[PDB]
Ligand binder design. Structure first.
Ligand code: CD
Ligand code: CD
Ligand code: CD
Ligand code: CD
Length: 81
């Protein structure tokens, strides 16, 4: 039932109670979750992952975001909890 880190170059135990997800993937920490965007390694002192793959400088981190409205506030408001 242990979760596994998405970083192949990383050696960490991902707890099912503290798994950092990214796009549906499991990671040891949010550090690896972003696949080292600033070359920042995971928060493990014995681990040395940062030059994984061909990451040079940064990655293409751009969100398409959500455009399913912004809760339009009209005069007649729906039932509030
Ligand atoms: Cd690591
Ligand atoms: Cd790690
Ligand atoms: Cd990791
Ligand atoms: Cd890593």
């Amino acid at each position: 039932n242990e979760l596994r880190c998405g970083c192949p170059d990383c050696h960490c135990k991902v707890d099912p109670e503290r798994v950092f997800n990214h796009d549906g993937e499991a990671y040891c920490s949010q550090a690896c979750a972003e696949q080292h965007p600033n070359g920042e390694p995971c928060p493990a002192p014995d681990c040395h992952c940062e030059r994984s793959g061909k990451v040079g400088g940064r990655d293409i981190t751009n969100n398409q975001l959500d455009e399913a409205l912004e809760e339009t506030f009209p005069a007649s408001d729906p039932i509030s909890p």
